[PDB]
mmCIF file of C-alpha atoms in Angstrom:
data_model
loop_
_atom_site.group_PDB
_atom_site.id
_atom_site.type_symbol
_atom_site.label_atom_id
_atom_site.label_comp_id
_atom_site.label_asym_id
_atom_site.label_seq_id
_atom_site.Cartn_x
_atom_site.Cartn_y
_atom_site.Cartn_z
ATOM 1 C CA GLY U 1 0.210 0.199 -0.171
ATOM 2 C CA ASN U 2 2.734 2.357 0.210
ATOM 3 C CA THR U 3 1.855 6.336 -2.235
ATOM 4 C CA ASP U 4 4.450 8.661 -2.503
ATOM 5 C CA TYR U 5 6.184 8.641 0.972
ATOM 6 C CA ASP U 6 10.340 8.043 0.666
ATOM 7 C CA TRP U 7 10.782 5.049 3.072
ATOM 8 C CA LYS U 8 14.366 4.419 2.421
ATOM 9 C CA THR U 9 15.748 7.621 4.007
ATOM 10 C CA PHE U 10 13.849 6.268 6.741
ATOM 11 C CA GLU U 11 15.810 2.871 7.716
ATOM 12 C CA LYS U 12 19.523 4.220 5.902
ATOM 13 C CA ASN U 13 19.261 7.608 8.435
ATOM 14 C CA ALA U 14 17.864 6.346 11.582
ATOM 15 C CA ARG U 15 19.714 6.001 14.753
ATOM 16 C CA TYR U 16 21.358 2.951 16.402
ATOM 17 C CA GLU U 17 22.787 2.949 20.118
ATOM 18 C CA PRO U 18 26.654 2.741 20.670
ATOM 19 C CA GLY U 19 27.899 -0.537 19.325
ATOM 20 C CA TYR U 20 24.677 -1.687 17.627
ATOM 21 C CA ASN U 21 24.324 -1.362 13.251
ATOM 22 C CA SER U 22 22.091 -2.011 10.977
ATOM 23 C CA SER U 23 24.561 -5.131 10.110
ATOM 24 C CA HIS U 24 23.462 -6.689 13.342
ATOM 25 C CA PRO U 25 21.176 -9.781 12.694
ATOM 26 C CA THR U 26 18.035 -8.140 15.103
ATOM 27 C CA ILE U 27 18.664 -4.961 13.508
ATOM 28 C CA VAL U 28 18.577 -6.342 9.507
ATOM 29 C CA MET U 29 15.813 -9.036 10.704
ATOM 30 C CA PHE U 30 13.551 -5.933 11.859
ATOM 31 C CA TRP U 31 13.500 -4.269 8.657
ATOM 32 C CA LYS U 32 12.646 -7.062 6.573
ATOM 33 C CA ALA U 33 9.473 -6.395 8.222
ATOM 34 C CA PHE U 34 9.364 -2.733 8.203
ATOM 35 C CA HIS U 35 9.814 -3.401 4.526
ATOM 36 C CA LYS U 36 6.690 -6.176 3.459
ATOM 37 C CA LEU U 37 3.599 -4.277 5.827
ATOM 38 C CA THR U 38 1.662 -1.847 4.299
ATOM 39 C CA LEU U 39 1.238 2.134 4.703
ATOM 40 C CA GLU U 40 -1.526 2.005 7.030
ATOM 41 C CA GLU U 41 0.974 -0.178 8.680
ATOM 42 C CA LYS U 42 3.372 1.923 9.089
ATOM 43 C CA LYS U 43 1.735 4.897 10.198
ATOM 44 C CA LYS U 44 0.817 2.441 13.592
ATOM 45 C CA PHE U 45 3.840 2.387 13.850
ATOM 46 C CA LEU U 46 5.483 5.384 13.899
ATOM 47 C CA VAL U 47 2.229 7.455 15.754
ATOM 48 C CA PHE U 48 2.975 5.235 18.868
ATOM 49 C CA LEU U 49 6.579 6.115 18.930
ATOM 50 C CA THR U 50 6.309 9.879 17.498
ATOM 51 C CA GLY U 51 3.747 11.830 19.289
ATOM 52 C CA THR U 52 2.423 13.549 15.518
ATOM 53 C CA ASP U 53 -0.090 11.006 14.006
ATOM 54 C CA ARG U 54 -0.784 11.048 10.418
ATOM 55 C CA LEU U 55 2.977 12.336 10.019
ATOM 56 C CA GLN U 56 3.613 14.516 6.912
ATOM 57 C CA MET U 57 6.370 13.764 4.185
ATOM 58 C CA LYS U 58 8.656 17.024 6.187
ATOM 59 C CA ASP U 59 7.944 15.048 9.074
ATOM 60 C CA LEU U 60 9.099 11.403 7.681
ATOM 61 C CA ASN U 61 12.527 12.245 4.850
ATOM 62 C CA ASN U 62 13.684 13.475 8.717
ATOM 63 C CA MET U 63 12.250 11.446 11.167
ATOM 64 C CA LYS U 64 14.752 8.937 12.660
ATOM 65 C CA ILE U 65 14.108 5.780 15.292
ATOM 66 C CA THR U 66 16.749 5.271 17.852
ATOM 67 C CA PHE U 67 16.778 1.136 18.150
ATOM 68 C CA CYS U 68 16.962 0.241 22.047
ATOM 69 C CA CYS U 69 17.629 -3.125 23.868
ATOM 70 C CA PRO U 70 17.765 -2.445 28.100
ATOM 71 C CA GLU U 71 20.334 -4.451 30.528
ATOM 72 C CA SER U 72 18.211 -6.883 30.487
ATOM 73 C CA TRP U 73 15.805 -7.219 27.554
ATOM 74 C CA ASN U 74 14.441 -10.791 27.134
ATOM 75 C CA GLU U 75 12.900 -12.219 24.309
ATOM 76 C CA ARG U 76 8.620 -12.277 25.433
ATOM 77 C CA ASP U 77 9.518 -7.861 26.499
ATOM 78 C CA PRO U 78 7.247 -6.342 23.999
ATOM 79 C CA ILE U 79 7.757 -3.513 21.691
ATOM 80 C CA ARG U 80 7.942 -0.122 23.565
ATOM 81 C CA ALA U 81 8.601 2.885 22.611
ATOM 82 C CA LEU U 82 8.540 6.669 23.915
ATOM 83 C CA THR U 83 7.784 9.828 21.900
ATOM 84 C CA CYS U 84 11.271 12.120 23.753
ATOM 85 C CA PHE U 85 13.365 11.033 20.657
ATOM 86 C CA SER U 86 12.040 8.087 18.783
ATOM 87 C CA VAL U 87 13.553 5.632 20.554
ATOM 88 C CA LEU U 88 11.777 1.888 19.709
ATOM 89 C CA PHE U 89 12.487 -0.022 22.549
ATOM 90 C CA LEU U 90 13.839 -3.912 20.065
ATOM 91 C CA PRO U 91 14.809 -6.942 22.023
ATOM 92 C CA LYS U 92 17.569 -9.502 20.649
ATOM 93 C CA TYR U 93 14.768 -11.769 19.309
ATOM 94 C CA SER U 94 15.869 -15.256 18.667
ATOM 95 C CA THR U 95 13.992 -15.706 15.505
ATOM 96 C CA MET U 96 13.167 -13.547 12.554
ATOM 97 C CA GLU U 97 8.835 -14.395 12.887
ATOM 98 C CA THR U 98 8.939 -13.317 16.702
ATOM 99 C CA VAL U 99 10.073 -9.859 15.263
ATOM 100 C CA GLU U 100 7.147 -9.323 12.630
ATOM 101 C CA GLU U 101 5.090 -10.960 15.169
ATOM 102 C CA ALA U 102 6.262 -8.275 17.588
ATOM 103 C CA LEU U 103 6.137 -5.512 14.999
ATOM 104 C CA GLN U 104 2.237 -6.569 13.825
ATOM 105 C CA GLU U 105 1.425 -6.362 18.331
ATOM 106 C CA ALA U 106 2.743 -2.548 18.859
ATOM 107 C CA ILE U 107 0.703 -1.579 15.994
ATOM 108 C CA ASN U 108 -1.813 -3.727 16.864
ATOM 109 C CA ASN U 109 -1.885 -1.152 19.710
ATOM 110 C CA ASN U 110 -0.174 -3.485 22.148
ATOM 111 C CA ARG U 111 -2.960 -2.587 25.538
ATOM 112 C CA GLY U 112 -2.250 -1.510 28.877
ATOM 113 C CA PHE U 113 -0.184 1.745 26.829
ATOM 114 C CA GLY U 114 -2.190 4.118 28.872
#
């Protein structure tokens, strides 16, 4: 469902914590899920990661995400995010499926976010 939105620039310009890179297994498998989903689904992702809904192209083309896995991350930890500097809490999932499903979980509103 993509429609005139430069997503390459987004995955390319994103931030990682010191010692993490897009080449890390967990992060490449994360991007894989972000590329197969539709426009509606990725909008939900951004809407919970950022503090602005239905973000404009001017926002998206400079928008970044900061990947983070807490010192005590867990394989079953839910994917959360903070609107401070767009940090996405991504645990070190052992499989490519668990990250694909977790991507859906959070966009589908993982509940208890009150």
